[PDB]
Design a protein around this ligand. Structure first.
Ligand SMILES: [Cu+2]
Ligand SMILES: [Cu+2]
Length: 465
């Protein structure tokens, strides 16, 4: 196996600046070359490291021949630096943003948010990481050797043309069910291996797929200790045998490397339209873990953090957000899916498409924020997928929120801490959300489905603070 590539840990320079160059290059998948995009590279990006309470200025150089934006998914920052569809960086141009980090330690990420082209731009290779650190987390003695026992794991699927190029399309099928492929990448590589010291291994898992949900496990069924979610440390570790991860969600887990036998991190088949088509109809290797006898001292603490209590529900503003899809889109999309793949496309399951996906009866309008949310006050947002059968990992910019109910039930323990994404699929979810920073109509916050093709075809709204 190839060794697992490790995104460079990128810190501020002497003048508190960081440089990111967005550019086209070449990558190789199964010996066949593909044009790919990356941040400071051919593909994917670095891990930008940030400290709570410390400002940094990021200089962003768009070296593509098309417009793009740069969104910091998970970051509690004003709209002005949030990099939504309004944050155009012109081809060949430079834009600088100041990030004043004021949130708990977490693994966040960044990616484009170009109007109607987010799916393509992510599919082409653009994604990076954000490692936020604070006073508190460094006291825990968690594994911390970057790329040795503290390893990022960005898992993505791609579809390739016969000639080896990435095969991306926003068409009627993918507008309905999302863009998905038959090849799995782990930090850009096909089934790589990582050499992990005996003791404890920390994986910072990111589901960077456009539309594919994942469910992580190990090949020999050893447990995963979930220590962190989108927005940071849980109160204490949650021990699981498997870990579902929605598009754009991050979890950090520890895995015990307690002997010398190699094992795989795998993803288990999911029940989501399109996603159980072979070879994802069976458990699928993500990466091979090879135990090695080199120095490590990371540990699993009993107690990780203390989070605030859920706010009292009494008197909070409630906002309804009804997710919907044009029924003509669902029919045609599911029709083209069967025409392409056949029966397996429905395993586990019991006309201008460009504006067919909606929230509150409206496809995204960049010039029309849907509402003004309060600043510094909890609100209760109620997001409903009643009426359609698709999966909608619902993401809200400018915040880390608490899940009160997820798609019918109180959240699983490992999902009860800080989240920026909530599952919506045929039912209704509730979040307790607070915005610590402002966003004017000219640089509004987004709230949207993170199934990228849904977002690109209207399942997004803007809101101010
Ligand atoms: Cu985001
Ligand atoms: Cu959706």
């Amino acid at each position: 196996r190839p060794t697992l590539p490790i995104p460079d840990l990128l810190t501020t320079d002497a003048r508190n600046r960081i440089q990111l160059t967005i550019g086209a290059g070449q990558s190789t998948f199964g010996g066949k070359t593909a044009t790919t995009w990356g941040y400071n590279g051919n593909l994917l990006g670095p891990a930008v490291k940030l400290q709570r309470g410390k400002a940094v200025t990021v200089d962003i150089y768009n070296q593509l021949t098309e417009e793009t934006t740069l969104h910091w998914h998970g970051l509690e920052v004003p709209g002005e630096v949030d990099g939504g569809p309004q944050g155009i960086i012109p081809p060949g141009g430079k834009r600088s943003v100041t990030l004043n980090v004021d949130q708990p330690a977490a693994t966040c990420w960044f990616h484009p948010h170009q109007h109607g082209k987010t799916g393509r731009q992510v599919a082409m290779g653009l994604a990076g990481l954000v490692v936020i650190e604070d006073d508190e987390i460094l006291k825990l003695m968690l594994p911390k050797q970057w790329g040795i026992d503290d390893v990022p794991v960005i898992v993505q699927d791609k579809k390739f043309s016969a000639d080896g190029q990435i095969d991306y399309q926003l068409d009627v099928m993918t507008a309905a069910v999302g863009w998905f492929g038959d090849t799995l990448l782990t930090n850009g590589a096909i089934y790589p291996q990582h050499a992990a010291p005996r003791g404890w291994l920390r994986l910072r898992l990111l589901n960077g797929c456009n539309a594919r949900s994942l469910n992580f496990a190990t090949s020999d069924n050893r447990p995963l200790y979930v220590i962190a979610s989108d927005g940071g440390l849980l109160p204490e570790p949650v021990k699981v045998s498997e870990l579902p991860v929605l598009m754009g969600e991050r979890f950090e887990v520890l895995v015990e490397v307690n002997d010398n036998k190699p094992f795989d991190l795998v993803t288990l088949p999911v029940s989501q339209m399109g996603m159980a088509i072979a070879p994802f109809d069976k458990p699928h290797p993500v990466m091979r873990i090879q135990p090695i006898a080199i120095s490590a001292s990371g540990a699993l603490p009993d107690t990780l953090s203390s989070l605030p209590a859920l706010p009292s529900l009494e008197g909070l503003t409630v906002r309804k957000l009804q997710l919907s899809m044009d029924p003509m889109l669902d029919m045609m999309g599911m029709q083209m899916l069967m025409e392409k793949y056949g029966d397996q496309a429905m395993a586990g399951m019991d006309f201008d498409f460009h504006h067919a996906n909606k929230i509150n009866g409206q496809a995204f309008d960049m010039n029309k924020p849907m509402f003004a949310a309060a600043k510094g006050q909890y609100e209760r947002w109620v997001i409903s997928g009643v009426g359609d059968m698709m999966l909608h990992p619902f993401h809200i910019h400018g915040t880390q929120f608490r899940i009160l109910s997820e798609n019918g039930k109180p959240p699983a323990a490992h999902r009860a801490g800080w989240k920026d994404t909530v599952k919506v699929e045929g039912n209704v979810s509730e979040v307790l959300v607070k915005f610590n920073h402002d966003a004017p109509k000219e640089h509004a916050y987004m709230a949207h489905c993170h199934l990228l093709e849904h977002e690109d075809t209207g399942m997004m709204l803007g809101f101010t603070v």
